[PDB]
Amino acid sequence: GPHMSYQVLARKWRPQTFADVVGQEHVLTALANGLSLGRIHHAYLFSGTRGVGKTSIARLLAKGLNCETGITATPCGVCDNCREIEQGRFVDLIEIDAASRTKVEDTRDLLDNVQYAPARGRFKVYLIDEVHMLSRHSFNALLKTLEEPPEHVKFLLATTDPQKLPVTILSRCLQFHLKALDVEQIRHQLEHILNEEHIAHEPRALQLLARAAEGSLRDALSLTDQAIASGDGQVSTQAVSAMLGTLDDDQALSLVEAMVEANGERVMALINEAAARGIEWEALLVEMLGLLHRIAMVQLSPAALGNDMAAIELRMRELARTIPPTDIQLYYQTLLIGRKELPYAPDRRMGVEMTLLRALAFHPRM
Amino acid sequence: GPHMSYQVLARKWRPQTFADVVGQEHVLTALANGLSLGRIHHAYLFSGTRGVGKTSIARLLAKGLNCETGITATPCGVCDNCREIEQGRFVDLIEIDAASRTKVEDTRDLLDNVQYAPARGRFKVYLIDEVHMLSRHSFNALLKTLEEPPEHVKFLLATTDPQKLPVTILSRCLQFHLKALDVEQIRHQLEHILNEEHIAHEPRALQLLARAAEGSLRDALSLTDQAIASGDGQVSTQAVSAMLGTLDDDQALSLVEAMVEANGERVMALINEAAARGIEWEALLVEMLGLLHRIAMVQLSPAALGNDMAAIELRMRELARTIPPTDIQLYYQTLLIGRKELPYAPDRRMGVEMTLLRALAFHPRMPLPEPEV
Amino acid sequence: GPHMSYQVLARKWRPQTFADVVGQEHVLTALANGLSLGRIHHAYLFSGTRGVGKTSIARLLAKGLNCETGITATPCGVCDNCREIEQGRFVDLIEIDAASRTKVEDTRDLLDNVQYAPARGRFKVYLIDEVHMLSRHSFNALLKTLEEPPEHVKFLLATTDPQKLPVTILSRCLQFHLKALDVEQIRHQLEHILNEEHIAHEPRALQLLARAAEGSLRDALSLTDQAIASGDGQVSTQAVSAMLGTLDDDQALSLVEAMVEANGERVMALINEAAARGIEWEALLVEMLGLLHRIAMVQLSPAALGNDMAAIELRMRELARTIPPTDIQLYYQTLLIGRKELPYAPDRRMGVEMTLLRALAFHPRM
Amino acid sequence: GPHMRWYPWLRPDFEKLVASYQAGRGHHALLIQALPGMGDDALIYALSRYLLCQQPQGHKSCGHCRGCQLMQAGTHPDYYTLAPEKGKNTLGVDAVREVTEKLNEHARLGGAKVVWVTDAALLTDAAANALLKTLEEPPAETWFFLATREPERLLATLRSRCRLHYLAPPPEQYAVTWLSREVTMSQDALLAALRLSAGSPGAALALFQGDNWQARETLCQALAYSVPSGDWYSLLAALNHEQAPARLHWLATLLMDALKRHHGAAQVTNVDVPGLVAELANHLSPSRLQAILGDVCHIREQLMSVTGINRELLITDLLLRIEHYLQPGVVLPVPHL
Amino acid sequence: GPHMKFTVEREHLLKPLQQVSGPLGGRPTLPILGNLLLQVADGTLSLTGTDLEMEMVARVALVQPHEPGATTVPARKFFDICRGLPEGAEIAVQLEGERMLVRSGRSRFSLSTLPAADFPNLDDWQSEVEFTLPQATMKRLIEATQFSMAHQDVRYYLNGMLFETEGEELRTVATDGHRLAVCSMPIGQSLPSHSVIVPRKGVIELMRMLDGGDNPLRVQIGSNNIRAHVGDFIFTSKLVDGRFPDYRRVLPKNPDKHLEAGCDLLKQAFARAAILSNEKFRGVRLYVSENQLKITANNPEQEEAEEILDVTYSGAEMEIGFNVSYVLDVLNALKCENVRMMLTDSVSSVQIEDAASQSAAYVVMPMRL
DNA sequence: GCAGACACTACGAGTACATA
DNA sequence: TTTTTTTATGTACTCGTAGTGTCTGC
Ligand SMILES: Nc1ncnc2c1ncn2[C@@H]1O[C@H](COP(=O)(O)OP(=O)(O)O)[C@@H](O)[C@H]1O
Ligand SMILES: Nc1ncnc2c1ncn2[C@@H]1O[C@H](COP(=O)(O)OP(=O)(O)O)[C@@H](O)[C@H]1O
Ligand SMILES: Nc1ncnc2c1ncn2[C@@H]1O[C@H](COP(=O)(O)OP(=O)(O)O)[C@@H](O)[C@H]1O
Ligand code: BEF
Ligand code: BEF
Ligand code: BEF
Ligand SMILES: [Mg+2]
Ligand SMILES: [Mg+2]
Ligand SMILES: [Zn+2]
Ligand SMILES: [Zn+2]
Ligand SMILES: [Zn+2]
Ligand SMILES: [Zn+2]
């Protein structure tokens, strides 16, 4: 049994070689140059937003550090050490789920055993995951070890929130900022993996997944698995559109034109109709934000408009022809605040109603 | 140079002589004069921000007090005690990681063995690092020992936030606050280190590293190591600028100039250029806010620009000569609100663009005209 | 060790007769009258501010009680036991650091040593330092011993925090509370030691040392030793001022002084000095808000100033009397808004500086 | 007592979800975005019944194997539940840590393992972080189930590692038909309850079953008394209870409908009570109505979020501030960016 | 029908009942958890106690004609109701509704019960491997490597023993990343190759269960749990899901430097040197020269200890520093006459084994200061 | 032995304090 | 003349109990 439970894409498609890593070119180049030149450090801190790949990058660094080929920038992936660390049975590599072993007793017990020799590999790599969840005493216990560790031990911290670490911990480590993946990178990676697994898909669906993933490969991959489960083995545009939440109709522009006209009757009728269609309120607010942004953008510079969708942008030119920029700016700010406070509402529909009523109250007479 | 296995820039270049410290003059002079005059207090606490030299200065004092020759402020590099303490595992110095010995059951064991005579040297130097981590009972145990210690025991207390110490502990010992380093000192130290290691460097990259170090030398030196890694073993302006994830002003100065001139087309063009470079959009707002804050600095007082911004100084002054303070207040507030609202924007580029649009549209001197009526 | 100057002023200048303790007349006279007139209690508990003389006065009581020339306030200092108490150790004076012996397994042995007759002196004297750290069971044992104390033993407990002691221990102990030394007494003493130590000095430096002492004479002596260190065996005004400026931590109060004074350069210099020390900026804003709230409360009523802010009482009183309430409310509003906007700033330093610049724009100088 | 009360609107989804597990390609972590009391617990329970069954058939458990018997009895070595401790509305990190440490050992019955959290929105930050990695890469044959009011309310890191299933509430006509079958009361009140429960039939049914309907009627009467006179303080007698957030939400919905009536919206959340909403619309100006609505919802959010807050002080201050807002010539709050 | 006729004698069950009780109901985790199951089968009464992790069953022989079935009762109540009866007692247990009535002469007591369907229990399962182990063999196997278990370490797979069966050999491997112990013994039975990771608690409970060479032990290992039958007692503990590391790649491959010495002399010397060793860093530095072993140690107080041993050494002069506790433990476990040590490099691990028998092996990983 | 005695070490509980 | 306190997690400390190593006259 080759770990059947790995059928989940997020567990099967994690890279095993530096070349397999998508994006993050700066940190990859820095790691490769450090390994090749011999400029090896003892405390790496990969910090970035969630689902970007710092755990996988750290595991690849550990693979490169503990390979029998030597201190190589590209792990072989077939040596005994590489196979063992893939299996997770490698003694010399210690993965600490710091969000669970956050107590200081465990940290002190671990640090009292740093002097001993590694079993097989050259280095005794410490993969401390979710460092920010350690207790303050646990942080302060790490200072002396991180400053001057023995030559056979290396700490590979990996946090999703670097600012919560004490400055004394950030000071001893090489901070690698894992840049959030762009839309194109996510789309290309999703296409590559789906074509590898022979799964039906449409480029538009992949574009929607990449845009709605909010700059994360793990989010995009989880959404892809959700779409696969929903659509019976195919990533179809209609299924992923109904799943993620899309506005194929022009009800967003109608809502904007009703609100900017201070037509509460039309605004509430459109809200009722959209709710009757099971609209996703957050995606709706995002669409209004985009429409208002394009309206202001074309108000500043003529043309340079929603030429992509000519139909609505004509009426958008009318809107930009009438509405003063200050009203557009305040409408956008109020919609954004409503999106921010949408979770803090008894109901999403009620939150959208709050946002639109606040927008109406600015110019209720006109 | 030798650079045996390149044993980290931070660890390799630790100070070894009182003339090698990068300029904590207010504590260096006091320690040298106390050692010269024989006024060797039995307890003193080093405090200050991260990576300034508290532990290094403590090791230097142990060097000076354990030297085979007379007690001097200039320890020799040939002395057996000095060599041992440089390599560690010294007989007299007792490295005590207080964070690993917070429990009073260990401080009592420490106190039980204080009276035994040192094997070598003169003063059994107790170097307690991260003193603020000790438990309350540990501090109270340390109290009477610090008040009247044995004549051959010196206490070397170091921490980062002395205010967490009990006040009587602060009373029993001297206090040395190590100020954060200035930018020029950091730059000179980085130049020295890179020259001694024979690595190509440029003035702008080193100035950027010093600015990003935020006054702590260990941060500067780790950042220099990471920049060496980022380049092909060479420190350059492009490499450091890419690594720090920021733009070298200028571009942001053009951004703010197009903002204050109500040149929305130029604002959009520069945003497109930044997108082509692919810089962090929050970095754009942060740098623009920083430049507006520096212009406010210049507005308050003319002597508010350092050499770091000298490359644009003549330009920057002209900004403070034309923008009324209330207009810069409005600009800073609008950009700050935009940064507040950026994470909830439909897209980060969308949020930055809308922030710039709001900043230029609310411009009092050149507002965006109402379209028709 | 080498050369007599190694003796720390906090140790060498330990008072040896009741005429040497300074500023504690309300306890010295009571002890002298009790010893002379025969009035005596089972136990005497000392308390007060750090470095005021509790342990020194307790040692003086131990000297006085155990001199063969009669129980008297003033010991001769010539005979065997008077010197043995100070130089070397005296058998019948039992000095116990309660912090080192908190567990009941040591106080049990101590009270097993109370039934034995004293060797040299008439009164078996116990001096227990830091009695507020004994364990609860140790406190029970000590109370059991104090319930029926033999006539040949008298206890002496010295502590800094009297509130932690059991009420049943306070009930049987005649507590002597020592007030913090006045600035004039500290200055006169420092001048006395400096003149008698052949150390040059200047009166303004002595006044600065006394003010910075915070009332504890040990703090004054330590700062004196550091001032001698900072320089060449000379207490110069410039060296003392520089050292205090290096060690000063009242950035917030001097900063609000400069802000209300509308001195922008002073505010910027103070921000620079706070940055040099690595002062937490959010903590600085919180402390400033607290100071503004307290000064407003002072304006409402002079009773708002308690003993907690005796060090900065005069400055806050004078800055309350000279400043109208409206400026206080405007500054509080500006600083609160600035703290609200501080996290969303390019960095904490520029954010707090920008808040201060916003505050300075109100009612500026020519 | 309350148990696996299966609901018809779960039928299309359940048959789907089990399919994702029938092929063996299902995600180990399934976060259910379902409104409270709508049926997420029953669906998760049935899914776990299918998963832990040694000899299952089709889309239901056999009910004969020892796993089914142990599951029915409420004790099972391979069925862990993470629920708030009795008397405390939070899920400590200690329970999550104990469960995660137990997951290391094999399943006792030789089958799979199930870890079901009753409500992921009640996770403490420490507990959710302790569950992060366990969610990411669980051992062989390990299944996680999470339920939430709002997925975005969860931690931004935990929600990333989970396939998210959304349970769509039934259309309003279907829901009103179902509740009319379940409860024999007026159509207006039933529709008002469904709209109050955000369209979730289960929450409206629970509202009618409990005393919450009587409390809502009393609050409506108190509002009717207080609107013309401004005696909003009396509302405290109806507002202060262990279920204060629900009554604050009812007041917020009433203000919603008053603003709608001023704007003339065709449909309203409170259709059963037209007199009170008309009185609120005519007596109170929309400008002050918006401020009162915002303050009421802010107080509701504060009361829900921070645990240990005192209901008496918050509700009393809200009522006093509302009364102050009623008086003319008083500045009104503005939403903060 | 409520038959449940239990007819047993008290003294023949008090020791089994105390055995199966063990960690009896004291945990309020589950009401059913704090209970013991009585079952009748094969002419014997099975007493089952389980806390969802460890299961213990006593098979006590019956006396009189019985009535098959099963029901669970409060464990503490049953333990206390038969521990005070004078000497022997004719325990007659009967079912009445949801009640057990226990009678013996003029002594009638009641215990409210629960049906056996609710009690979690393991039925028959296909064993992956089966062992017929002499008690001495397993006792030596566990004893010589029990000290090498990881005590609550981050690596969860190290929290126990690896029972690896290969051919007609059974091996136990225990390590924590600093020490390692391997003990292999023959069985004379063709057994399929398999690997088992039994947790710390399971092996400790198993170790304090077997005694007396008169009752051979029967071990049944499946894919999810391990069961041990000692006489009439049955123990069951779940397995660890992890994968134990390849120990044959942990032992040094080319131990060029050979040392042989007396076990007693080495043990005495190491204890003597450890007298003055560091309190929490009990590590000695050992120099090997031609037929000479110099062991040295010190403390922060600098109370150095030094001793010289006359050994049979083959190799070059060498320095290596290792902790004393692991080596004292290995030497104590190796109740032998000659200890053979294998050394490769001043940075490599040290092997320790019996010089007169190739049945055990130990690895000590040195200290790199 | 040996088991008691004694030594010693670990765990729990009850209490106190810190932090956000 | 009887009335008032928020949580969740962690870190020490001090004490009795509780279980076990070991070893000395028993
Ligand atoms: N740079 C990358 N290259 C390839 N896959 C990636 C990358 N980053 C993330 N992934 C995908 O995301 C999944 C989780 O990645 P992970 O490294 O755990 O992110 P994190 O930094 O948030 O812990 C991986 O299994 C892999 O499929
Ligand atoms: N004043 C200084 N002079 C020279 N190097 C310094 C100085 N301060 C810090 N460093 C560098 O930082 C490294 C560690 O400094 P350290 O003294 O540990 O800072 P900390 O005060 O945080 O413990 C040193 O090895 C040295 O290279
Ligand atoms: N009233 C005083 N008179 C003279 N010296 C004092 C006085 N108070 C404190 N000191 C100085 O401080 C040193 C320590 O004083 P001590 O009485 O131990 O303070 P504490 O109250 O904290 O125990 C003494 O040696 C003495 O030099
Ligand atoms: F989610 Be990752 F470990 F930052
Ligand atoms: F990093 Be230092 F010792 F504060
Ligand atoms: F400094 Be005192 F003896 F508390
Ligand atoms: Mg990770
Ligand atoms: Mg240090
Ligand atoms: Zn390899
Ligand atoms: Zn020297
Ligand atoms: Zn005398
Ligand atoms: Zn079944």
Residue numbers in the entry:
A (entry chain D), C (entry chain B): -2 to 363
B (entry chain C): -2 to 370
D (entry chain E): -2 to 334
E (entry chain G): -2 to 366
The paper states:
The dataset using the DNA-primed p/t-junction resulted in four conformations of the ternary complex after 3D classification. We first discuss the next on-pathway state where p/t-DNA binds inside the clamp loader and clamp, causing both to constrict around DNA. The primary motion is the pivoting of the A and B subunits out-of-plane into a spiral. The AAA+ modules of the γ-complex and the sliding clamp adopt a helical arrangement that matches the helical symmetry of DNA, similar to other structures of clamp loaders bound to p/t-DNA. Clamp closure is primarily driven by the relaxation of ß-clamp subunit I into a conformation that is more like that of the closed form (Cα-RMSDFully-Open_versus_Closed ∼3.3 Å versus Cα-RMSDDNA-Open_versus_Closed ∼1.8 Å). The Cα RMSD between the Open-RNAp/t structure and that of the Open-DNAp/t is only ∼0.7 Å. Both structures show that the duplex region of the p/t-junction adopts A-form geometry as expected. Because double-stranded DNA prefers B-form geometry in solution, it must be converted to A-form upon binding in the central chamber. On the other hand, trans-acting lysines (γ Lys141 and δ′ Lys130) directly contact the Walker B motif (Asp126) of the neighboring ATPase active site only after p/t-junction binding.
Clamp loaders are pentameric ATPases that place circular sliding clamps onto DNA, where they function in DNA replication and genome integrity. Because the sliding clamp is a closed ring in solution, it needs to be opened and placed onto DNA by a separate ATPase complex called the clamp loader. Here we describe a series of structures of the E. coli clamp loader in the process of placing the clamp onto a p/t-junction.
